[PDB]
């Protein structure tokens, strides 16, 4: 069950953003959204794909364990913040593409396909090249599917060891406060064009007191200056709901 | 750890606040520690609520705490602090130092298992005299700052005699600050104000995972006035800021 909450639309129109926010208290039993149609529309995951990629890297032994360091070979990478040795949390937080590309290459097509099927991850379409299907290939996932996937992770119900799920959950912590912990991951496909915009994402969950809230936000984006809206719109909505 | 050296230059942060205390800071890659006071770093004090760390691990390892999603339900009975009068997750109980929750865990673990684990953990003087639910609060248990960091390193490395999963659970429950470049895991403790001639002790212990480095730390101080309690965080935070670790 997905229900439309029209009052959240204020945060989108105030910014002239085409987008969707999906929020589920306690479980995916019932979610609320500003837009029923867009809630189940599928988009390129971009770096939100780091979450399944890291789980699969762990499960297959490509990532040795929680303390694995991804060493920089000294060669140019697309962002300076990637040009350094990284832990799994570090590679996740800076969204270090070449680290996840090398994980994906060693996982290989057969195992990658198998795990995306086990995780019911979007259209499970990995065509477009092993080290770029989530960046520019055919893989698509909706905000609803993201929250379903995050809930499984939270409950250790994905087809992976409990240890590996716990490892990725810790690597995903982005805000710690006395009353709550936020686990989250951003994504940004690029700007495309005005007529064919990129997509930006922010997905995760908030463990607040004894409750949990799963969330997934996405928006069309054609200008990088608008990127902070992927956190501020959902954060404003979660603020007015009393969650954070 | 591999070595320890005395650095008297952090003393400024203590003298500025008229605090008698000790900071111990260890860099995991070099296995080298620094401290303002070698003598105090080896001195053993009541752990107070820093004991929640081993107590949580032991509670999980024995099955007393079912899993990381265990909710500790409030019975409706008055507690010493309003904070504690609510259902709590494991992180919640840790972050508010909910004594009665930890008391019930220890009672359920029991003396024999608690002794066994504290021995396996090499936890302080391993003395659980004082009653199963208060030895770490007003009993005979004592631990030094050096022992705290050694214990925390073994936790970080999953080297304690507990499942990897349970250590993982406790490590995330201890998260107190998250930034893009670092994650702080920590726990406070506070024994009481004692008297002027016999002050209580306040602690702050934990570790910072910073880039690919890890820094283990343990702070304690004499305390005879609750108003001084925030210094247990501000002194070591100021030290770690000036070291370029956090901030």
3-state helix/strand/coil string of A108-174: CHHHHHHHHHHCCCCCCCCCCCCCCCCCCCCCCEEHHHHHHHHHHHHCCCCCCCHHHHHHHHHHCEE
- A77, with CB counted inside 10 A (0-12, 13-18, 19+), is middle
Q: Report the C-alpha gap between B67 and B163 in whole angstroms.
A: 12
CB atoms within 10 A of CB B182: 21
Whether residues B92 and A174 touch (CB distance < 8 A) is answered with no
B153 chain-A contacts, CB cut-off 8 A: none
Q: How far is CA B159 from CA A128, A130, B130, B245, in A?
A: 42, 36, 29, 25
Bridge-partner residues for B218, per DSSP? B24, B205
Write the DSSP symbol of residue B194. B
- Residue B227 burial by Cβ neighbours in a 10 Å radius (0-12, 13-18, 19+): exposed
CA B78 to chain centre: 26
What residues of A are in contact with residue B157 (Cβ under 8 Å)? 67
A180 beta partners: A177, A208
Residues of chain A found within 8 Å of residue B96, distances taken between Cβ atoms: 178
A47 is catalytic: yes
Q: What is the resolution of this structure in A?
A: 2.1
Of A85, A166, A209, the CB nearest to B168: A166
Q: B178–A178: do the CB atoms touch at under 8 Å? A: no
Q: Is A30 exposed, middle or buried (0-12, 13-18, 19+ CB in 10 A)?
A: exposed
Residue B94 DSSP class: H
CA distance A28 to chain B (A): 17
Helices and strands (H and E) in chain B: how many: 9, 11
- Cβ–Cβ of B89/A173 closer than 8 Å? no
Between CA B47 and CA A104 the distance in angstroms is 46
Rounded distance between C-alpha atoms, residue A197 and residue A191, angstroms: 6
Residue of A nearest to B92 (CA): A209
A87-A91-A94 Cα angle (round to 5): 130
The verdict on a CB contact (< 8 Å) between A173 and B168 is no
How crowded is residue B96: how many other Cβ atoms within 10 Å of its Cβ?
Answer: 18
Report the structure determination method. Answer: X-ray
DSSP-derived letter for residue B13 is H
Q: How many Cα neighbours within 13 Å face the side chain of A43?
A: 31
Nearest to A71 by CA among A85, A87, A91, A90: A85
Facing residue for B183 by CB, picked from A85, A89, A94: A89
Domains and CATH numbers, chain A: 1-244 (3.40.710.10)
- Residues of B with a known catalytic role: 49
DSSP string, B102-171: HHHHHHHH-HHHHHHHHHHTT-TT---TT-TTTTTTTSS--EEHHHHHHHHHHHHTT-SSS-HHHHHHHH
CA torsion sign, B96 to B100 to B101 to B103? positive
User: Distance between CA A8 and CA A206 in Å, rounded?
Assistant: 18
CA–CA dist A87, A125 (Å, integer): 28
């Amino acid at each position: 069950s997905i229900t439309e909450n029209t009052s959240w639309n204020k945060e989108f129109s105030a910014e002239a953003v085409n987008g969707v926010f999906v929020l589920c208290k306690s479980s995916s039993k019932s979610c609320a959204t500003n837009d029923l149609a867009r809630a189940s529309k599928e988009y390129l995951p971009a770096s939100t794909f780091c979450i399944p990629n890291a789980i699969i890297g762990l499960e297959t032994g490509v990532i040795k364990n929680e303390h694995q360091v991804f060493k920089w070979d000294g060669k140019p990478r697309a962002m300076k913040q990637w040009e350094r040795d990284l832990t799994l949390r570090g590679a996740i937080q800076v969204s270090a593409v070449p680290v996840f590309q090398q994980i994906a290459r060693e996982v290989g097509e057969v195992r990658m396909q198998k795990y995306l099927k086990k995780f019911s991850y979007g259209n499970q379409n990995i065509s477009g090249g092993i080290d770029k299907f989530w960046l520019e290939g055919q893989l698509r996932i909706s905000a609803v599917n993201q929250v379903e996937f995050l809930e499984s992770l939270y409950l250790n119900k994905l087809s992976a060891s409990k240890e590996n799920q716990l490892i990725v959950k810790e690597a995903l912590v982005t805000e710690a406060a006395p009353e709550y912990l936020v686990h989250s991951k951003t994504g940004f496909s690029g700007v495309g064009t005005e007529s064919n915009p990129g997509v930006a994402w922010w997905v995760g969950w908030v463990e607040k007191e004894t409750e949990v809230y799963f969330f997934a936000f996405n928006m069309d984006i054609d200008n990088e200056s608008k990127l902070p809206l992927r956190k501020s719109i959902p954060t404003k909505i979660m603020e007015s709901e009393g969650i954070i």
